[PDB]
Design an enzyme around this catalytic site. Structure first.
Site, PDB file in Angstrom:
ATOM      1  N   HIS A 128     -29.793 -40.818  48.961  1.00 18.87           N
ATOM      2  CA  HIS A 128     -30.424 -42.064  48.453  1.00 18.87           C
ATOM      3  C   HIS A 128     -29.849 -42.532  47.126  1.00 18.87           C
ATOM      4  O   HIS A 128     -30.579 -42.897  46.199  1.00 18.87           O
ATOM      5  CB  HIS A 128     -31.941 -41.883  48.348  1.00 18.87           C
ATOM      6  CG  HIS A 128     -32.735 -43.144  48.578  1.00 18.87           C
ATOM      7  ND1 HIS A 128     -32.847 -44.141  47.631  1.00 18.87           N
ATOM      8  CD2 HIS A 128     -33.498 -43.533  49.628  1.00 18.87           C
ATOM      9  CE1 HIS A 128     -33.640 -45.101  48.089  1.00 18.87           C
ATOM     10  NE2 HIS A 128     -34.047 -44.759  49.304  1.00 18.87           N
ATOM     11  N   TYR A 167     -36.994 -38.686  47.330  1.00 18.69           N
ATOM     12  CA  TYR A 167     -35.654 -39.046  46.767  1.00 18.69           C
ATOM     13  C   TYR A 167     -35.502 -38.597  45.301  1.00 18.69           C
ATOM     14  O   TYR A 167     -36.390 -38.856  44.467  1.00 18.69           O
ATOM     15  CB  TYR A 167     -35.424 -40.555  46.920  1.00 18.69           C
ATOM     16  CG  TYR A 167     -35.689 -41.036  48.339  1.00 18.69           C
ATOM     17  CD1 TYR A 167     -35.106 -40.379  49.428  1.00 18.69           C
ATOM     18  CD2 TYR A 167     -36.497 -42.145  48.596  1.00 18.69           C
ATOM     19  CE1 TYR A 167     -35.328 -40.764  50.684  1.00 18.69           C
ATOM     20  CE2 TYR A 167     -36.732 -42.562  49.925  1.00 18.69           C
ATOM     21  CZ  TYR A 167     -36.133 -41.859  50.958  1.00 18.69           C
ATOM     22  OH  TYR A 167     -36.337 -42.256  52.285  1.00 18.69           O
TER      23      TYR A 167
HETATM   24  O1  LIG Z   1     -33.768 -43.706  54.935  1.00 20.45           O
HETATM   25  C1  LIG Z   1     -34.783 -44.435  54.689  1.00 20.45           C
HETATM   26  O2  LIG Z   1     -35.698 -44.544  55.558  1.00 20.45           O
HETATM   27  C2  LIG Z   1     -34.763 -45.262  53.459  1.00 20.45           C
HETATM   28  O3  LIG Z   1     -33.947 -44.638  52.502  1.00 20.45           O
HETATM   29  C3  LIG Z   1     -36.118 -45.775  53.013  1.00 20.45           C
HETATM   30  O4  LIG Z   1     -36.824 -44.672  52.579  1.00 20.45           O
HETATM   31  C4  LIG Z   1     -35.966 -46.824  51.930  1.00 20.45           C
HETATM   32  O5  LIG Z   1     -36.110 -46.178  50.679  1.00 20.45           O
HETATM   33  C5  LIG Z   1     -37.017 -47.893  52.100  1.00 20.45           C
HETATM   34  O6  LIG Z   1     -36.887 -48.435  53.361  1.00 20.45           O
HETATM   35  C6  LIG Z   1     -36.924 -49.003  51.068  1.00 20.45           C
HETATM   36  O7  LIG Z   1     -37.877 -50.035  51.230  1.00 20.45           O
HETATM   37 MG   LIG Z   2     -32.215 -43.756  53.474  1.00 20.20          MG
END
Ligand SMILES: O=C(O)[C@H](O)[C@@H](O)[C@H](O)[C@H](O)CO
Ligand SMILES: [Mg+2]
Ligand SMILES: O=C(O)[C@H](O)[C@@H](O)[C@H](O)[C@H](O)CO
Ligand SMILES: O=C(O)[C@H](O)[C@@H](O)[C@H](O)[C@H](O)CO
Ligand SMILES: O=C(O)[C@H](O)[C@@H](O)[C@H](O)[C@H](O)CO
Ligand SMILES: [Cl-]
Ligand SMILES: [Cl-]
Ligand SMILES: [Mg+2]
Ligand SMILES: [Mg+2]
Ligand SMILES: [Mg+2]
Lengths: 414, 414, 415, 415
Positions: D223, D156
């Protein structure tokens, strides 16, 4: 487990033609029942079942209720109509009945369980003038009904082909009179939207004066007036605090509810006539009604009814499923299983049943002091005695009340 | 079959100047009649016909009514105006008349057939105070009229160049008085929008007290007040349940109806002045009126009138075509053929005809106890005796009533 | 004067597709009307809706009051606005217009405003397994004189069809469309891949424009086979190829998505062969969300309501393209064309050829020459039915197979 | 008949990520329910919300009234609609659905409408330091049978992660991303450059389409790492690469910006793993502002509300993509998949592999084969927990480091 046979039973134990579906499986004794009742069309619905949905289902697993609903819904390409939807409802409710029997649980237990221990009912009362209505309502209240639909006359007429006799009765009573018709006029059941609308607020002023404000009073405009006159009616009824005013517009006039809701605080119920998402969804989305009225068999059964109830729930709108005499006891049970499991239950319309309905459909809910108490038996908790059903053959025919003409002879949406 | 000759006839048998079109064909005896009447402009409409549409039509097949309408409408490039549209109406109605004669059927039979067996009429009543109006209305009710337009005085004035005499009459009667004018003022017919608006709800309270709520009462504001004062008027008239309030705004003020309709439940009629789709369409689309008032010759005849009636039908809006004295009996018949074939017919304004109109135009509809009964003859069922028409030559001139000034001398839309 | 003496339904399939026809008899010897009720997938439910209900409702009534009969028949069963109800009403309504024209001695187009044009422009269907087959088919249609051509590759979703109920012919699937793999077991159905379909389409039209040029008008029917956002992308991706229209980018149940589509794309949009209800078509026309209204006029209740929808479209600048494939009777084809002749806003008329058996069973079918249809000038709808010959083509009936359309994972899709 | 006798919370981390599980016991020996409460960053606040409040609230109640318990538990503390409150409610709600299926002898998917498909389509995560590493990773996922692949370069914001709490693995940052220079001193945090990140993304997808082709479906998660207008530009810039979806282009607090985005871009949009409140998700679904709803179902309160959101989405033409990374228990994974099987509008199911320890501690985990998940047919959620083995994986706890995300100048960003 798979579907072996699907049949339609046409029966009229309550004096009104019903369409019932029975789905049989390869498990001995395990079958499901559903309600297809569009009473004015029973033979077209019967065809839509027996010639199409019945052979479509043979050999399929009844467990896939949603897949069956979605695939049946589009099986004829064209869709979203009262014959198509009622046929689909008969199947869908029978499949829920089988799922609950397989589970050993009532359908309400599958849909989230009980949210209340009795179902509040409203009943119809009527009379030719405000004293007759008052007396009829009082008699229902004495039976334990706390919600009462009050109607007076038949929309400004007498339920006949002529307005002159009722007009003279109105003259003598010093009340508002319906109009004189042209010197010749077409056959039909004549009424007067203007006399009707102008008379309604006085009826409710009288009922409040005599019956008080504790009881809940309902009124059904039944698409009988122009939209602007319905807006005015809704406003004029505000001082009387009705539980709801029903069907102030036809489905084809739903765009007028935007204006009504900018003006009136009287609660509004719509939708016994609805067959199509493009009717109900914009009204619920925009907060244009407080109660959704669908006749669940006309929207396709339990599966779509639960979705409409949820869509309503998340918009703050409550349920009031349509349930007068043209619904079978299987459909009455389906309404009440949804009612029990819905957080957003509003009210349940009820037409008292005779002994014949109770004997042809064992398992009818118990009614005690204005509440219905459904049984705890698996599935929809309802059965049909096919031999006794065959002793009440359907009448058929074209109803006369649906030719409703205003004083000048104009056909109106009835 | 082809058009051989097109002519205009100017005649005034009812004391009001009319413009009539006659289209002749190559079939002996087969001709059609149409109404072009914009009474204030008869010579400009005559030119628009005789110098332009007439030669445009010679040698064309009259059967292609739509192609002729569409091509005539744009023949001068610029379009959408009362002179242009009235000329087009004279042609269009005559072509419908010929089509019905060719078919051996009334035009109403071509437009969908009868939806009712009589046409409900409303008539004008007036008086200088509420008792005079009450008496005038009662006399029309005794003749069988069930819908009555009630006006009092002339918009707060006397229909003269000065307000002082009527103001003194109001002082003596203890009623609301019009304002004093400046010490010198321009010629015109003086009125008082403020005295008018503030007086209106009391007039209707009186008429309801005396005449009751069975009769339908109408009122025409005729663009005589500011939009906000019209909104207030519409609200103040709600308790009296008028059938409609007409022309609360000028066409140039149509944007104010959005605000009016967020507040008032009094039904609204608009549009005798309309010439242009950008006037009527947004009002119908947005449910801003309950009755469309077009003078059909000012929108171009039967062809466009049927389209506006349908556009209204699918929006829940009804028709009330404009039909006072400045319309010929050919236009009265055209209004009534549309009225008979429209599901959405609202009401038909009617000005009683004299013997001269009936003799110059054989075929005028029969009026019996507040309903009109059109004849069953082919086409528009109407003729014109050209020799007798020539005995009622038109007056011409500039009308005086259209110089309407408020108390300070301001020219107002009349 | 006249009154209705008998109403009957005739079920016949001379073109290999089940049709429903209504005949209304009057008291005048030889004067009768014909109408089209064809909802091909439901013929027996429509037959009941006519024979058991609308037929007895009409006996003894004056056929002249077309609107009063339409309005009253429409509400006679209370519930209304659906394909079985509306098709039954259409069979009645068209036959009453047929009677009105015969009474008048005039074609129905003459009652509706007269001719606005002297020929009705047609579009025709081309298909093929790959871009070259589609190209060859389209080039042949151009050589035959058609100026408007719908181009599919594997019909709808790329799946072709094995079901004779659609076109009365098997149609080969798209051969190079490379669908996702399904799970290890899957339900019965006709599988298609919406993603592979959507991506194939702009490539098809690039090839067709490269080979055929920009003079010819080209059409495509998405037939509700993709998600709304993917239809928005497809409408935008097709803009360089200037389609005459992209048809049914959304299902009727998804009409609210057209607001978003129309803020983005300038590809013209056609909708509505599926529409049964004013709450479907009216908002789209009011809001300029479509350029062509596609109704199957029997599914909206006949000539009476079709004329109203055509007028409502006209005043919104929207044009007509009535649905007219194989499942419509020649009576319905004539009704479409009588509306087409009399509408200022006529857009285009879909056409699929009528075989000799259809032409024999229904004397009066329009003539087609060099891309235009020419209707005759006989009174009424100018069409007849030979009942004896119609009986030689009994209907197949049954449940169609093509309407179980499943995506690769087994999901039922609106077909 | 049945009544709840005990409610407890189990905190366990067999996959290297802290999980919260609820077990509800009844009076019937051996009949108990399991549910997922996992808000991994808050496990002790969720544990209190269950043990001190919802557990005593439930004792002696009939578990059959799932909706009455959900509605009443939801309001029991007055204030509501937040991640600690909703996750506690989810643990209860899922366990009651588990009990209902066990009482019925049926999987929860059978109570919810039955199967609409025979396998659940999965997407998986690929990442890498540069476009070639991402390409190699994606190509390997394709070889393994996955048809839907999320592609990030440096996870991210391009920052990768050193925090084992996210994926239970360190992830390398984007190596060629050339961030702006920071001031001469700066606060502690995990620095990323939103501008360099946003520009990198269309180049990544151009390379992936060039190398991998257009058959495979490719996904990207923004994100909430960029400003709304820069997310609108990114959605538009990605249109030629036809992503299956672009996820979380805005923070929940910026949802009003999606009106503008949807007037411009046809790239499909997914939102909502962060959503806790109806006033977040409802307007987006009503207004067609997203194509996929992403809720972490425990953060919206469990199966009861998830089914409602799935239905609300269905009627708006929006599909489901429930959040399912490492911080969800196998109970939550099964709940997602039971909804997925029974929803007509299923979109896709995120999947991250479940290690052997997870599979041992939670008997019943779904099988994954060739890009699809296959849930078992056992009653309830078809999942169990070995309490003894769960105790061998005590939770790490603590404050995560990756959630202090700072831009080059030191500004805290929503991470
Ligand atoms: O799309 C995804 O799977 C999410 O963005 C996760 O990467 C979150 O960042 C995480 O679940 C936070 O605890
Ligand atoms: Mg996500
Ligand atoms: O509210 C109601 O119960 C309805 O309006 C009924 O009165 C209907 O008219 C009837 O169900 C039609 O068959
Ligand atoms: O409603 C009406 O009948 C009109 O308002 C007339 O009163 C007009 O003023 C007249 O027709 C103008 O020529
Ligand atoms: O554009 C078309 O012609 C239609 O989409 C048809 O192909 C329908 O699929 C068929 O009419 C259904 O019965
Ligand atoms: Cl139907
Ligand atoms: Cl919280
Ligand atoms: Mg009702
Ligand atoms: Mg006027
Ligand atoms: Mg199509």
């Amino acid at each position: 487990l798979f579907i072996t046979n699907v049949k339609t039973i046409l029966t009229a134990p309550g004096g009104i033609d019903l369409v019932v579906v029975k789905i049989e499986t390869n498990e001995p004794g395990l079958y499901g029942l559903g309600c297809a009742t569009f009473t004015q069309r029973i033979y077209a619905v019967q065809s839509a079942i027996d010639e199409y949905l019945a052979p479509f289902l043979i050999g399929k697993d009844p467990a896939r209720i949603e897949d069956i609903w979605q695939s049946a819904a589009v099986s004829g390409y064209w869709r979203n109509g009262p014959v198509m939807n009622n046929a689909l409802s008969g199947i869908d409710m029978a499949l829920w009945d089988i799922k609950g029997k397989q589970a050993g649980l009532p359908v309400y237990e599958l849909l989230g369980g009980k949210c209340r221990d009795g179902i509040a009912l409203y009943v119809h009362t009527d009379g030719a003038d405000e004293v007759e209505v008052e007396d009829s309502a009082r008699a229902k209240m004495e039976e334990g009904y706390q919600y009462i639909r009050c109607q007076m006359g038949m929309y400004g007429g007498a339920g006949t082909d002529d307005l002159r006799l009722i007009a003279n009765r109105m003259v003598k009573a010093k009340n508002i009179q319906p109009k004189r018709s042209p010197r010749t006029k077409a056959p039909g059941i004549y009424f007067d939207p203007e006399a009707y609308a102008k008379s309604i607020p006085r009826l409710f002023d009288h009922l409040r004066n005599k019956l008080g404000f504790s009881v809940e009073l309902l009124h059904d405009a039944h698409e009988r007036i122009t939209p602007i006159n319905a807006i005015h009616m809704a406003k004029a009824l505000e001082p009387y605090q009705l539980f709801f005013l029903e069907d102030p517009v036809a489905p084809e006039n739903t765009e007028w509810l935007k204006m009504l809701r900018q003006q009136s605080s009287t609660p509004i119920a719509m939708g016994e006539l609805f067959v199509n998402v493009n009717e109900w969804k914009p009204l619920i989305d925009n907060k244009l009604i407080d109660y959704i009225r669908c006749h669940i068999s006309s929207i396709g059964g339990i599966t779509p009814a639960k979705k409409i109830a949820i869509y309503s729930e998340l918009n703050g709108v409550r349920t009031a499923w349509h349930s007068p005499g043209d619904i079978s006891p299987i459909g009455v049970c389906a309404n009440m299983h949804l009612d029990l499991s819905s957080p957003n239950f509003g009210i349940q319309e009820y037409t008292p049943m005779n002994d014949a309905l109770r004997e042809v459909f064992p398992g009818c809910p118990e009614v005690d002091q204005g509440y219905a108490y459904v049984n705890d038996k698996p599935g929809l908790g309802i059965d049909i005695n096919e031999a006794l059903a065959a002793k009440f053959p359907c009448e058929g025919g074209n109803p006369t009340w649906t030719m409703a003409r205003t004083p000048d002879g104009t056909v109106w949406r009835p």
